[PDB]
Amino acid sequence: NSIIDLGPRVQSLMEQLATTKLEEGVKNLDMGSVYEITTVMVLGNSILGFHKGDLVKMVRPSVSARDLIGVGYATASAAVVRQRLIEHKIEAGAELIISGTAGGKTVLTNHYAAQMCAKGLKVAVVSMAEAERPLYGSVLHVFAALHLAAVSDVDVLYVDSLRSVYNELGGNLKGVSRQVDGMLTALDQYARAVNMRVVFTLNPSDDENVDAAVRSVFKTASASMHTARRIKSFAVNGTAFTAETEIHLRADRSNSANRVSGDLVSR
Amino acid sequence: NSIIDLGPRVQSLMEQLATTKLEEGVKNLDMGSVYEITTVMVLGNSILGFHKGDLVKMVRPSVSARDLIGVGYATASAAVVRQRLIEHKIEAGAELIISGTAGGKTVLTNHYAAQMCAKGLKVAVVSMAEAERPLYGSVLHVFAALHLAAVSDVDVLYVDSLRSVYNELGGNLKGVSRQVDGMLTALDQYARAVNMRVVFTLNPSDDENVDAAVRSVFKTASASMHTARRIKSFAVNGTAFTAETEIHLRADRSNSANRVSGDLVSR
Amino acid sequence: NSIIDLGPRVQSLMEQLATTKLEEGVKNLDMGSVYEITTVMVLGNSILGFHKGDLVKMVRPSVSARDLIGVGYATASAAVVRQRLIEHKIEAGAELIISGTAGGKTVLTNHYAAQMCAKGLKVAVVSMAEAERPLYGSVLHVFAALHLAAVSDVDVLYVDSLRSVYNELGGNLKGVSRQVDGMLTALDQYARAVNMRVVFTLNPSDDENVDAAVRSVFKTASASMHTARRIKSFAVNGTAFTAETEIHLRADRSNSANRVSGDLVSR
Amino acid sequence: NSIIDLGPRVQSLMEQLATTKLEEGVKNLDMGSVYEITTVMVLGNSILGFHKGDLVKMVRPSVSARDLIGVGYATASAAVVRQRLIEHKIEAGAELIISGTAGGKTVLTNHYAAQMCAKGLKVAVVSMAEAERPLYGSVLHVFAALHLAAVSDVDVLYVDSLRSVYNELGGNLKGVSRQVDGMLTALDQYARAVNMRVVFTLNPSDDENVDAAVRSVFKTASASMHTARRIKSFAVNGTAFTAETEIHLRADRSNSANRVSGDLVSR
Amino acid sequence: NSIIDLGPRVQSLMEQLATTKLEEGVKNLDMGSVYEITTVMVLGNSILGFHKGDLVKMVRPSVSARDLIGVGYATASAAVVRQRLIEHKIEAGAELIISGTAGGKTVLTNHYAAQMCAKGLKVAVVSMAEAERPLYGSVLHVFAALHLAAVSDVDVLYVDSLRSVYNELGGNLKGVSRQVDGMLTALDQYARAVNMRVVFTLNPSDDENVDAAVRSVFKTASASMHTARRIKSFAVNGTAFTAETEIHLRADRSNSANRVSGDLVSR
Amino acid sequence: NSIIDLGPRVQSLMEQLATTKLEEGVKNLDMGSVYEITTVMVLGNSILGFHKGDLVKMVRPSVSARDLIGVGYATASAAVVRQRLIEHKIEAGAELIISGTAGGKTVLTNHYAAQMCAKGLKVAVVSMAEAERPLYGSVLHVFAALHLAAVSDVDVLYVDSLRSVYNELGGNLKGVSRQVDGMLTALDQYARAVNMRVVFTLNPSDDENVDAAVRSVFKTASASMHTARRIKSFAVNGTAFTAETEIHLRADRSNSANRVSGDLVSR
């Protein structure tokens, strides 16, 4: 068992999606057939639909897709079940790992990814909106990665990070918090509909007050997502790391301190 | 007797409304035939009309719909009368439940909805613009929910919340208060025309000064709507709640303090 | 003799004007044939003309209607004379009733309207841009109400209020005062051309400094219109009211204090 | 001999110019044939030309008229000479009468117009951008007045006022002073080309600091125009007036104080 | 020998360029055939090319002209050599004469132009963006004048002034300094390519802090152009003038004080 | 061996790219055939592709190129390997030379370019966004130069400077840092894909706080690029220079002080 990098698959799909006629649709793709899922997202005022593993079609409705849908959603077949999540007692939904001046969000993601892979889960990782990463990290890249993972034999998906999406929704401008709330709620709703555990990461480094943005996004994520994790402290001792974290679980409303340490895992 | 959740019906209608030709119209719908009501709303510069339970058509008039209509209205036959509202002495119109840092607007909504259901009224609830809720809560979702309840056998409708509409009208930007006034008035005028009691909720949590926004929206709602209720204090004691509230009744201009307590009712 | 509510007639005309082809014109209307009047108004860069009681047509001129006309005017045959205004010695032109934190502009309007009706004048009232009022109060609604009254047997018309028009012209933003001046002058010019007495009301409640906006609009109205009335104080004693007012008469340039009291008249 | 009011002639021309096909041209007009003059003006990015007394045509050039022309000019035959200006030793060019909080610009205009009429000159007056005046006072209204006076037997033209043009050019916003400079230079250049004396008036009453705007526009007009006159003080004693004025003559660069008094002349 | 005024030639070319089909081109012009030069400039997102003395054509490229070219340039055969500049040891390039509150930029320009004319050079002057000057002074007028002087037997060109271009590039707004830098570099690059000495003048009189704008434009011009001259002091004694100036020479990086006096030369 | 100036080749390509039909493509170019590389960039919402040495075609996809790609990339055959970089142990990737008030970025670039040329590498230099340089320095000019150097026999490329790109991405406005991050990452990713060493230079001289902009861009470049070099001090002693520099190496995370001195090398 090993961790799958979904990055190149998103990159090749984006090349195929660079058509002048997406309204006609792009057929004969091989996105995946393990699960029957339909991903419907809003791009501007238009709707972009990912139908199973074969079709991707854009529609321009008479009324804006913003008024119609808002952000996006998933519809799954009644047969869709990720058995390995049940066996290892991992609940479907989205999780957020947020950090500020302390950092260590990528180090923690790699730690949790390797931990799940060692446990027996089929783990996928997609790197975006960060240095040394080819994917820019737009809302399209997030929904394309979510869909590619959903229709595939992927139990846990790691999206590192939402930096570009946060910027796209005006997060670095201080109407803004509503759009971030909407995105976070849609991502948790998606991971539930698709029966997958999605872990998203964010470091609002482009913001004026980085730690104040962390505190507000953490409060938002605490209500909108299954799990919200804030890195308070982070330090590296050669090949090992240690991080002082604050975790919120929506289920029991609890806010507890958790110390997480381990070795540096490469990606 | 039980409370009806209109959310899934709004969601299915939005899927049907995702057409490239809304100018041609979407026929053979089954929105309801209890009351002959036509809902006319403005979407940008265009008009969206909900004709009885069968048709939904968009028109793009030569002059902007903003200059023509403004927000939206309802037209009905002289036979549109809700007998249960007369029997239980409940006046038609819109009501607002507003809260700030105290919260408890959803808990109060569920309390009043269960109270009306126990009284013998046909109660419908629609959830939107909040965490864990599928509906985004756009102006379209509010008018679609209003129309579905209007043409159906619904005496009282609860819309929780107007958070997205408030944001859409620039409420979180500080010309703004005029658009909020216009919406609130149109919502009361609608409920009177349709002869239904509609209860709207709002928590301006996306605003910079949340409690200052509550005080100004409460003053606006006091004139624009039949009743305006402000939650001053709210606390939960296990399975029970207690809320210190301020209520304004437009009929006698009175502003009185009201203590409301009960058990936590799920949705 | 009784007061005519022009509101429903404006509402039905707006429904007929919701066409995709206003350039072709909307014929066979029955707006009125007592006086041969043509109302020309500017809507954006386009011209909207109300020809007698039969036609309403939109033209999109090569040069903007803003440069061509500005706001709007009325053209009438030499036979347009309202005999009842001569008999009761009432001069044609527009008058403004402005109030701030004191309020009572609607109460004063109803008082003066009932006073004119009792005198023997054919009085019409149009309610817009206010709570419990179906008409939004756009510039179109103002010009439609003016035209409907002008072509009919109406001696005095009351427009309560100009709140939406004031907002539309950027009055609540602080180039703005020029557009308000232009509107006020056009309305006085219209009433004189049409030989009708028109009484407009305004409460800049959407403004940051409401009483400072009242003082500046009152100074503008003092030059732009026949009469300008400012409510300084207003109080209700059961079924009776009393208001301390400041009135400006353009004819003698005089600014005098006037106490006006009476009973509460419903609309 | 009497003063001509050009206002109604500008108003009727604007009605004729309200065509959907100004690119095709509006022929068979009777603007005037005393002098062969062509007026070229810029309206947005388009060019509007007034050819003698017969044609008015709009052209939409490939490059913006702002880059091509800027504001506007006049072309005339070598025979354009106003003999009465030579006989009474009056030089061609534009003159500005500016006032602030002191007022009296209209009273002074009427005083100078009556003085020129009594001298033996053919005087024309156009009232615009002010209370009790039908013309809005756009750049179109100014150029149409200039052209009607130029092609006709008019020695001196009084334009009261440039309030709307000043506002149109962003004068009440504080790039702005360049557009005001450009207009003032174009108006003096026009009057010289057409061999007519044109007197313009301005009161920047829509400006935040009215007297500071007067001081800067007066400094600009001192260089851009033949003469610039600033009203420092103004008072009315029954039927008589007295004004303390500051006049700048471009010819000798001199800035001198001038006391002007007389009787109130109606328009 | 005498100084040539290029103003009327630029004015007549602009009249010929007022076509609806500049994409087709304006042929059979007689701009000049002394030197084979092509002037390419950017107008918005479009390209305007002046080909030798015969053609002027506009192209609308698929990608913006801003990304493609930036400002504008000149292409010429190496046979473009102005022998009189070699004989009188004058280097090709652009020169800036900048003044603030002191003034005297026009007086200095006329002084230097008469000095060069007396030396034996073919001198041309173009007056724009100033009072009593028909040319508005847009970027088009600057490039048209440069091209008309470049293809003709002109050794030294004087462009008084760049006031409108400075305003057009947002110079009077405080991204702005980059556009001014780009223009100044393109103008020096042009003069070098065309092998002509061009002297530009500027007085940022439309700026809030005129002398602070002079200091920053002088620093920019010191790097961007061959020579930058700042008028520190200026006074007129009847028919004579004296100016205290600061000159920067790019060649030796030196910044020295220079006193320049002479008689007032008319234009 | 000598240094190649790619500037004129970029200039000629831009002239060929000034077509109205870039969607049809511009064929039969001779950009280079040493390496099979395709450069894909985003221009607004459109995609501009440089296919090997023959084609350049623009596509306007249904969804924005911003959501699809973001900035731009390079695709190459497995045979794309620059043997001289292996022989001289030089790693592929982008490097940044940043300076503020100290200057000397061009002097250092010329020093390093001559040093690499003397070593035996095929060195190319492209001058843009600076005084005395014909290329404006847009994102198009950067990618055109990148592609032209990529498909050719060029081991090391010097791009002096990114001043215009920094301005284009809103770098001089204080959402901005995300776009600068994205560009810097894309350029490093490009250089790695194309297997070339690219050295970029930047002096944020158009910024309000130049040295504060240097400190933040240096921190960004430290993560986004292979190497980041900051000029702390710089002085010229006749024909020799000396610069106190701070260098960051991404490989070992180290931040060390480096003194670099040499002779002034012309370009």
Residue numbers in the entry:
A (entry chain A), B (entry chain C), C (entry chain B), D (entry chain D), E (entry chain E), F (entry chain F): 12 to 185, 188 to 280
Study text:
All P4 proteins form a hexameric ring with a central channel varying in size from 13 to 21 Å (30 Å for ɸ8 P4Δ281) and external diameter of ∼100 Å. The deletion of the C-terminal portion of the protein (residues 282–321) more than doubles the diameter of the central channel (from 13 to 30 Å), as the C-terminus wraps upwards from the base of the hexamer, along the inter-subunit cleft, to stick down into the central channel. As the C-terminal domain is (i) necessary for ATP hydrolysis (data not shown), (ii) restricts the diameter of the central channel and (iii) blocks the interface through which RNA is thought to be loaded, we postulate that the C-terminal region needs to be displaced by RNA for ring opening and subsequent ATP hydrolysis to occur. The ɸ8 P4 ATPase activity is tightly coupled to ssRNA translocation, as it will only hydrolyse ATP in the presence of ssRNA. The ɸ8 P4 N-terminal domain is composed of two helices separated by a four-stranded antiparallel β-sheet. However, in ɸ8 P4, these residues are displaced >8 Å from that position and therefore cannot contribute to catalysis. This suggests that in ɸ8 P4, extensive conformational changes occur as a consequence of nucleotide and/or oligonucleotide binding, which render the enzyme competent for catalysis. Nevertheless, the L1 loop contains a motif (LKK) that has been shown to be crucial for RNA binding. The first lysine of this motif (K185) is found in the equivalent position to K241 of ɸ12 P4 and is also seen interacting with D220 of loop L2.
